[PDB]
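User: Modeling request: complex.
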Amino acid sequence: NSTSLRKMLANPHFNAKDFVHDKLGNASAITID
Amino acid sequence: RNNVLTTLQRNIESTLNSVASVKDLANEASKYEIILQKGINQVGLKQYTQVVHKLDDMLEDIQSREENSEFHGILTHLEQLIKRSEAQLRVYFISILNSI
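Assistant: Request completed. Predicted assembly structure:
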């Protein structure tokens, strides 16, 4: 969901950049690639 | 549209590395001990200074991470290459600013 994730979350960094490593941070490094 | 760059592409281009991994920054930071140890005039203005934004911005979310050994070693390699770069900068400042 790079529209929702990329557009809607971290394009203006609202919310912060570490929560993407936290709220989406459970063994999903394939989806981070 | 300059605001579309300056708001969306600004913090988008900032939060590119919102999560980014641990070893790769050591790899390309070491490749910035390749390129940052090529001098200034070989490398060039926003080439050199923007690579300083790449280690500046590679020391970036690591305060946001956690304490392993690669954390401290990459803090050493990063910040000492940073101050090598900064010394080289002010050297070049003074180098032309009494070229008169």
